[model samples]
Target chain A: SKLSYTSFVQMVEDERSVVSEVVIRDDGVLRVYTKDGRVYEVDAPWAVNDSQLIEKLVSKGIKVSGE
Target chain B: SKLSYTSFVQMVEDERSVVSEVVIRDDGVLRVYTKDGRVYEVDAPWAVNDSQLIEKLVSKGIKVSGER
Candidate 1:
């Protein structure tokens, strides 16, 4: 199938305890599922800006060390 | 001063030879500088989606590994 959005993302939260890997849609929508089976939106634009995403992660104490 | 836009990004290219770090303005404008001192725009929307950004990196043969 021709994909409609982005896929394969890995992000780490601070303390290295919480790691988040995600797949996003082409229309710019994301659903983050938690360990508790809860889902939430990760609504962020693609290629828009690096900082916007960085700030959100950092604010949540996520350390963004690129691999 | 309160700034407009996003900032602070670190991305790694494949084979671990090239790493790209960038900052985007509030209006969604990005300038990526390569090792050769050449600069280019990385324009994309902010917080709208994740796959779009991922695609851009992959097309350039970059691998994205996350760290915190």
Candidate 2:
């Protein structure tokens, strides 16, 4: 699944993740899982303007490649 | 298939739609088909600020609950 920039950031903030065990890379590649075993793949907007994207996810127990 | 606001509209503009037959309701519920027979269900961002969404799709032959 592909996601746009604005939506990617908004999602992490607005929606509730069934599981926040994020497998994210530095290149804006993110893979998340839902309760339905549906794996969601998103090419995030990158940490260019929206820096909170990573921090927010981290706070919710989902980290980045550094982990 | 639940699509976010920004992604939904940007998709119609950025991506190449195999078929532009849109089944859209006034509430922003849109159903689209992919080459893989995947019927995408999207509760769009609605016709709030991003007005170009519906217009753009129409230009590509996808109308709002209008036709095939």
Candidate 3:
């Protein structure tokens, strides 16, 4: 499904304050299966356009372990 | 509400993988009167399996959402 949300990029003046990361492993990728699960890996390249929001998530303590 | 974890079948051990798909539709049989205003139209079949959750929700003073 196409998620339609106007880019909130302009409103985020402060990177540290606006973003909060939550590492919800199961819900993160919306994974429905074991091999089929999409583990959003942040390595080599960032998948999203809003780097600041990703930073916010990291700030909130987003981490994947035992992959 | 009666939600019991004992009924869950999660092995907590392993189950290889799972199934996946996406179904987004417009018209639905379970449609509500739209003369008011509500837009949660996933029409997705779901079961929370915790009647108490429903009770908790009802206990929270859940009000009519215009359509309800």
Candidate 4:
């Protein structure tokens, strides 16, 4: 249900970029739901600070939302 | 990818509605192109006036475009 943080970042930034957005979650795992509905799950540790990780994602042009 | 009109509408209105664009295809099925890259096929022959359908969808902050 959770992926390591380092692996998570690598997946998002590694390739030519197919990710469309990350779903905002209240739990420990966030998501990578891409342009075609392939879902990837990543962990947020529920304990780390991110200025709320959602903000960093927005800065990188990754759309994040409740939907 | 098959969705009934009722299900499709429910999906389009859901809190997690994934649609980024609805596609009107010439192939006899109108498709839902979602934010997550999923495709939903809705039977086109059930009726018409989806022009107004999408018009209202866009009005509700939805998006649609012609097929490639």
DockQ of each: 0.12, 0.02, 0.02, 0.02
Off by over 4 Å in 4: A1-67, B46-48
- Predicted candidate 1: what Cα RMSD to the true structure? 13.6
Residue A9 error, candidate 3, Å: 14
Misplaced by over 4 Å in model 1 are: A1-67, B1-19, B42-50, B55-68
Q: Indicate the residue-level lDDT of B1 in model 4.
A: 82
lDDT of 1 by residue, A1-67 (tens): 1211222233333344243433344434444444444444443345234555546555665343322
Ten-residue segment with the worst summed lDDT in candidate 3 chain B? B17-26
Cα TM-score per model: 0.28, 0.37, 0.19, 0.42
Best by TM-score: 4
> What is candidate 1's lDDT per residue for B1-68, written digit by digit as tens?
22222322333333543434333334555445455555555555552245555556645544332211
lDDT, model 1, position B24: 33
Q: What is candidate 4's local distance difference test score?
A: 0.59
Clash pairs detected, candidate 4 = A35-B36, A35-B37, A36-B36, A36-B37, A37-B36, A37-B37
Top candidate on DockQ is 1
Model 3 in CAPRI terms: which quality? incorrect
- lDDT by residue (A7-54, candidate 2, tens digit) is 434445555755445566544456665445556665432332344545
Better of 1 and 4 by lDDT: 4
- Assess candidate 3 and give its lDDT: 0.23
Distance (Å) between predicted and true CA of B9, model 4? 0.8
Clashes of 3: 5
